[PDB]
Write a protein that binds this ligand. Structure first.
Ligand SMILES: C[S@@+](CC[C@H](N)C(=O)[O-])C[C@H]1O[C@@H](n2cnc3c(N)ncnc32)[C@H](O)[C@@H]1O
Ligand SMILES: C[S@@+](CC[C@H](N)C(=O)[O-])C[C@H]1O[C@@H](n2cnc3c(N)ncnc32)[C@H](O)[C@@H]1O
Lengths: 1024, 98, 297, 99
């Protein structure tokens, strides 16, 4: 590297091959004075925002615009200006072709000075005719200027073998230019006289002139291939204004333009395109004994020396320059940190590197000196830039072998903390409700009212209300009542009653509705009435007439539904009003409203029909009353619970009212209700731990996000402090997903490391003593601009895949089965073993896989072990011992790799586990439990050839069944006791998915259940 | 006056353009090459020898029969000052009385 | 055949004149996307024949492939340009895959990973390298060979065995050929090496088949004749490109090849002079009965 | 009509205590917001001249000095003496007491 602002050299390039240039012909003079469409002496420049022409660039046929544009009088639009220039060049064209014939002067030379001053005197109307016959040059180039035809000091004056000219107006400002930073810069090249040029023969005569001439403002040379012979540049005190912070004079403007041109040429050098000049920089000659150290001209002289040497910048320069980027470059160059290169500018001669790729010292002779004593440890090849993307991209770390303290990582992340900012929340739960239903069976069992579990007594807590409000606010739906009513009708029209052989209900039942909210932003009724009348549910029969009741209707009447108001009796009624709003926050008044509302609903049912109840708060009186009253007088019933909100409500459905029947509650209903209250308790304990909806994160909670911000100067090997910071965030994050972004933050290129913390990451971070450190190379290679995004709490939007769901299932049952202080063994650990995140922090591992992993070896509190030995073999468990076997997904993987069956693989594995010392074990087998279903797009079946063929993973393996597994297991161990685990229908596993901040998309978890019943596991003790 | 950007264009117009005139043109330095260094030692100290800094611009004698032109620096300056004063009397919001 | 018998890159490879010729060729040559052309050629040659184990073919539809070294800059569709047409089956000689992952430290959708050092990830039935050994290297044949070593080792250990992979090799050396013959050729079922050609270079595309099955299997003389003729045609076309002038030059009649024009004027239907007749006939003797065009204006 | 008849501003500017004649804002919301954009752009360039972002990446400020700075810049009332009091010292109010 960083000279004052950083540059990315790493090698250095230069244009090697060179175009030798042609010279003037008068045929070419007429050709480019005729402003053709293909070529013309001007070229427009435009804005980068509007693409409107705000400046023009002109060249060789005209340079003599040194007079004032008030004297010239050009218009303001580019089209009128270019046709004006066309017709004035046409008039002067006719004049000069009058005075010179093309036939005799077909191929004779000219003074370019006389040509430019001729077109300038013609545009300024300043009596060009004395200048006219000096057009065709004599034997030499400059003696016609020394022996003057007419002395014209307004254009050029002589000084005794030294010619002074006033080169002006390389560019020309159009009036729509308004010093915008997105507008292109001008480098003070549009003023009257930005500098003066001293054309003469030899540098010795020119320096003998400079003995007497002033050299206050510095003098600039070109030294490579001058425009019209060897000369100098004498800038004046006119300054550049178009950079808003910085005000630079003329000489700094010219040197900055030339050095940026050399920076452009150093990138485009591809060893095949010869350019028009070998180098570009100017090399200040006599001002070094005038101005001194730590001046802007001196610093740009240093940069021009490095540019002539052939260095390349850090930031990729634009093709079209802007005042914004130019001022940013000037702010970077006047910053700090004086030098790291061994190079310094000189006045005696110019210097190029000993290993420079430029050949300009051998190309032209005078002025260019090769140096031998100065050497560079850098490379030779070119450099390329990477293609920027507007989206944030993922990154994955790789661990080295060194380690520092986790307290050092804490100190560095406290230094680099950018925690207090509000993230975007998202949604924890998308999709639809879940079918949780049970029917009444007559010959099933019998239970009593007092046996039923209830709501927990810690229901009205502020923390419970906090969790349920967090869940109901995080969850994303359309209309919840729409979802609930569609679910309850699709479960209501399923089975048949024992009296009639046909079905439950038919088409045209003349139904009634209770408790209409009637506010749904349009269609002022519940949103199922019109699609259910049209039959859009496609699993129901359409009714005949619909009446909506309740004290919030729009079309019906408003009636207190608790007190019995008699109305017309209908074959089917549907209650939807709660007992909370009509209640006054008491379980007693809630139960009493259930009593009265159910009594009115029974007495208004048109007997032989059915009704549906919803119950928010069931109590002993509620269950005992409905068992003593309704269950005798009903034919059949139904109780279901679709689930979009964390609540204790269920949907009770009756069938065949007012017929007596010996009928009580059953143990299947009991198991359903036990599991319902249990999954309520588990999901409430999940929602109690999660932070709120609209909070700000500060690294205080165990779950949440974390970001830090560092800046990277060039491709420099960055410091150990930032390395400890990034590796400490890696140890904080625990091998989860992370995204980065690279962008110029407000004048400096910044780096962001965006990911999320978890309690499993916390136990991982507490597991290891020292944190390992990472490879900086994977971050230091990137040179593209990764545009950032807002911080979101949830990366995933569409929902977790069912394979992520089964991985979460498996991780949960392994973490539940493992205990604290235990040696384990993981068969098929995968790329990164999640068993490090599952087990407690004090229990060691003996884990091994065929896949070579990159886990941090060493610097642990309790020891780890990582190796590869082709685990389906013997001899090694006699070496290393364990207590409990965890073989997840490696059975089918090894069987598909070795093309062998599950029977042979399992008997070999149970043989080498008879070699083992473990008493308990649990492995991932692939056994069908239910009748196979050939799940669409995830799991199809195969009867004969006995395969599965996952199409999502593109994977395939056989399956073995539980009786053959029992045969092999009892042939191995005559003492073992096997327990097949049931499927996690109580949703205990859901905390490990929620605390990792990932939504679920409940169709995926339905497919996950239907899949987990096709590859379960078991628990086998060696005793029993 | 240092940074012209600080003066607002549409809400300080005459000040903005007068500052633009001042930064755009005002007399420039120059030099004349007087004297001899041979018999007379160089009496200057800070400049190089026998050079004479002049606060305005010169161009030497085109011809020895002088006649009028307006294409020079101070008539240029007077013309721009009169252009400002014409613009100032042109803008009606300043004086409604004339 | 044996490893030591193979001819190699010429030792005059890093010349400025060789870089001049290869840059002249790669700048004069006209394409759409070169990576598009190379990947279409390597897939059309990859899905041809059958392996000796299974009677059916090499690979099938829905293989859940992975990609390495995505440049992701192609003026739109920020990924290599074969992913969408190959997923749609627009090549019409391939089977369409099921899932595509792109890796490499210049991706847009995947993750950026040092591919030389082994980072373990999900194992896929087919992976495709396209990462060079130049950008990650530091202009040395030793570090080029070592990057070939490490990248091929990671590609072998992340192959989901029973599958296949494709390697590209810019700088093969004695260590490279000897290592792959002692290591991979035993543990592979079959292989393939092709070279589509749009640029004057020494790189080849090595394709494997049936990883992690032992086999007595070495190099053969047909591969030897292919490699001899490959290096020989590289040498001939480099000697061709070394003589041709540059891209953006001006001609002056100095080179042995190039253009020539002259300009004369013709007053009426006059029998013009002997001087212009000698000039036109001298340009005829200079041009040697090739095509020529005139203009009258 | 859903036409913009009033605006609400907050934390980066509060120092509009002077008279709107002295300020001179236009009447349409679009011209007003682009006018505010370009004036904040000019003062943005000025304050980024006088303070670098690299050294002052994460240092504090007086919100009072910030609001009075943008107010004195909009009212053209010689903000430059108020300018170097931007970055605050150890406490919040002692810089205001010792003026
Ligand atoms: C939330 S709703 C059901 C709304 C609509 N069915 C739905 O599911 O979207 C229950 C309604 O019952 C009403 N309600 C409560 N107690 C009542 C009572 N004793 N008599 C009549 N209506 C009552 C409430 O006003 C409330 O609008
Ligand atoms: C030029 S490319 C191949 C381009 C690719 N075929 C495409 O279609 O865009 C090689 C890529 O691999 C990357 N690369 C080089 N060495 C690497 C390594 N050791 N690990 C990962 N990526 C690497 C380079 O950054 C480069 O983007």
């Amino acid at each position: 590297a960083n000279v004052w602002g950083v540059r990315l050299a790493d090698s250095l390039s230069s244009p090697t091959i060179e175009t030798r240039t042609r010279h003037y012909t008068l045929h070419d003079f007429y050709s480019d004075l005729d402003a053709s469409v293909g070529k013309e002496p001007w070229r427009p420049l435009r804005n980068q925002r509007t693409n409107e022409i705000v400046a023009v660039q002109l060249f060789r046929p005209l340079q003599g615009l040194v007079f004032d544009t008030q004297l010239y009088g050009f218009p303001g639009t580019f089209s009128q200006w270019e046709q004006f220039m066309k017709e004035k060049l046409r008039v002067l064209k006719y004049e000069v072709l009058r005075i010179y014939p093309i036939s005799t002067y077909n191929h004779d030379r000219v003074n370019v000075f006389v040509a430019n001053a001729l077109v300038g005197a013609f545009l300024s109307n300043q009596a060009f005719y004395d200048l006219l016959p000096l057009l065709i040059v004599n034997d030499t180039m400059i003696s016609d200027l020394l022996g003057t035809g007419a002395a014209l000091s307004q254009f050029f004056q002589s000084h005794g073998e030294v010619l002074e000219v006033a080169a002006g107006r390389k560019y020309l400002q159009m009036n729509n230019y308004s010093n915008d930073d997105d507008d292109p810069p001008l480098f003070a090249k549009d003023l009257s006289d930005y500098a003066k040029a001293f054309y003469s023969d030899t540098y010795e005569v020119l320096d003998r002139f400079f003995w007497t001439h002033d050299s206050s403002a510095g003098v600039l040379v070109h030294y490579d291939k001058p425009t019209n012979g060897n000369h100098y540049i004498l800038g004046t005190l006119t300054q550049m204004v178009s950079a808003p912070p910085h005000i630079i004079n003329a000489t700094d403007a010219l040197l900055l333009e030339s050095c940026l041109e050399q920076f452009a040429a150093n990138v485009r050098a591809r060893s095949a395109q010869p350019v028009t000049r070998l180098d570009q920089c100017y090399h200040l000659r006599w001002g070094a004994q005038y101005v001194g150290e730590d001046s802007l001209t001196y610093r740009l002289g240093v940069l021009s020396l490095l540019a002539t040497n052939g260095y390349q910048l850090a930031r990729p320069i634009p093709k079209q320059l802007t005042n914004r980027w130019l001022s940013s470059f000037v702010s970077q160059v006047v910053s700090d940190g004086i030098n790291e290169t061994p190079l310094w500018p000189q006045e005696r001669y110019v210097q190029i590197a000993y290993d420079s790729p430029s050949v300009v010292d051998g190309a032209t002779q005078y002025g260019y000196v090769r140096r031998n004593q100065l050497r560079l440890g850098m490379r030779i090849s070119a450099l390329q830039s990477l293609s920027d993307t507007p989206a944030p991209v993922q990154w994955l770390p790789q661990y080295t072998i060194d380690q520092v303290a986790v307290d050092e990582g804490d100190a560095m992340v406290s230094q680099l903390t950018q925690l207090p900012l509000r993230p975007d929340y998202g949604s924890i739960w998308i999709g639809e409700a879940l079918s949780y239903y049970v029917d009444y069976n007559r010959s099933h069992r019998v239970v009593l009212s007092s046996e039923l579990p209830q709501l927990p007594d810690t229901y009205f807590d502020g923390d419970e209300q906090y969790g349920r409000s967090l869940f109901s606010l995080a969850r994303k739906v359309g209309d919840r009542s729409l979802v609930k009513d569609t679910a309850v009708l699709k479960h209501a029209y399923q089975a048949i009653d024992p009296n009639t052989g046909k079905e439950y209900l038919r088409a045209g039942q003349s139904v009634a509705y209770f408790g209409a909210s009637a506010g749904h932003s349009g269609a002022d009724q519940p949103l199922v009435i019109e699609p259910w009348m049209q039959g859009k549910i496609s699993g129901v029969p359409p009714p005949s007439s619909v009446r909506q009741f309740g004290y919030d209707v729009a079309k019906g009447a408003i009636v207190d539904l608790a007190r019995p108001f008699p109305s017309g009796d209908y074959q089917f009624v549907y209650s939807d009003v709660d007992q909370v709003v009509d209640g006054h926050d008491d379980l007693s008044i809630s139960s009493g409203l259930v009593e009265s509302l159910l009594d009115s609903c029974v007495h208004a049912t048109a007997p032989g029909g059915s009704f549906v109840m919803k119950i928010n708060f069931p109590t002993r009186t509620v269950w005992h009353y409905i068992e003593q009253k309704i269950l005798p007088n009903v034919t059949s019933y139904m109780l279901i619970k679709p689930f979009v909100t964390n609540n204790v409500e269920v949907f009770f459905v009756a069938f065949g009212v007012h017929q007596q029947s010996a009928l009580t509650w059953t143990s299947g209903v009991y198991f359903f209700l036990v599991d319902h209250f249990y999954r309520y308790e588990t999901l409430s304990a999940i929602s109690r731990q999660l932070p709120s909806f609209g909070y700000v994160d500060d690294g205080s909670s165990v779950t949440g996000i974390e970001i830090i911000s560092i800046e990277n100067p060039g491709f420099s090997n960055m410091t150990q402090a930032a390395r400890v910071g990034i590796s400490g965030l890696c140890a904080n994050v625990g091998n989860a997903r992370k995204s980065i972004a690279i962008y110029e933050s407000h004048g400096a290129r910044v780096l962001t490391i965006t990911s999320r913390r978890s309690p499993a990451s916390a136990r991982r971070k507490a597991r290891l003593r020292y944190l390992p450190l990472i490879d900086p190379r994977s971050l230091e290679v990137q040179a593209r601009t990764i545009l950032p995004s807002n911080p979101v709490l949830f990366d995933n939007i569409n929902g977790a895949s069912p394979h992520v769901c089964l991985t979460m299932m498996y991780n949960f049952e392994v973490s539940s089965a493992v205990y604290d202080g235990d040696v384990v063994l993981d068969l098929g650990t995968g790329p990164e073993a999640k068993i490090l995140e599952l087990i407690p922090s004090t229990s060691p591992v003996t884990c091994v896989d065929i896949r070579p992993t990159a886990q941090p070896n060493g610097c642990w509190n309790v020891r780890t072990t990582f190796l590869e030995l082709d685990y389906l073999s013997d001899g090694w468990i006699t070496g290393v011992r364990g207590d409990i076997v965890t073989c997840m997904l490696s059975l089918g993987a090894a069987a598909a790799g070795k093309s062998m069956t599950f029977d042979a693989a399992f008997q070999q594995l149970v043989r080498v586990l008879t070699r083992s010392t473990a008493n308990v074990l649990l492995i991932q087998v692939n056994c069908p439990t239910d009748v196979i279903r050939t799940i669409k797009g995830y799991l199809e079946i195969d009867q004969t050839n006995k395969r599965y063929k996952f199409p999502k993973f593109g994977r395939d393996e056989p399956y073995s069944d539980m009786d053959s597994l029992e045969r092999i297991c009892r042939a191995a161990w005559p003492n073992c006791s096997i327990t097949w685990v049931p499927l996690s229908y109580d949703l205990r596993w859901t905390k490990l998915a929620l605390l990792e901040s990932t939504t679920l998309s409940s169709a995926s978890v339905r497919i996950a259940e239907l899949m987990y019943k096709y590859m379960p596991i078991m628990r086998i003790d060696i005793h029993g | 006056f240092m940074n012209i950007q600080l003066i607002s264009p549409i809400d300080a117009p005459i000040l903005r353009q007068w500052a633009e005139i001042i930064h755009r043109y005002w007399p420039n330095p120059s030099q004349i090459r007087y004297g001899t260094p041979n018999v007379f030692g160089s009496a200057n100290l800070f400049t190089p020898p026998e050079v004479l800094l002049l606060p305005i611009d010169h161009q030497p004698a085109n011809v020895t029969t002088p006649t009028l032109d307006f294409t020079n620096e101070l008539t240029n300056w007077r013309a721009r000052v009169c252009e400002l004063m014409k613009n100032l009397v042109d803008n009606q919001r300043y004086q409604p009385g004339w």
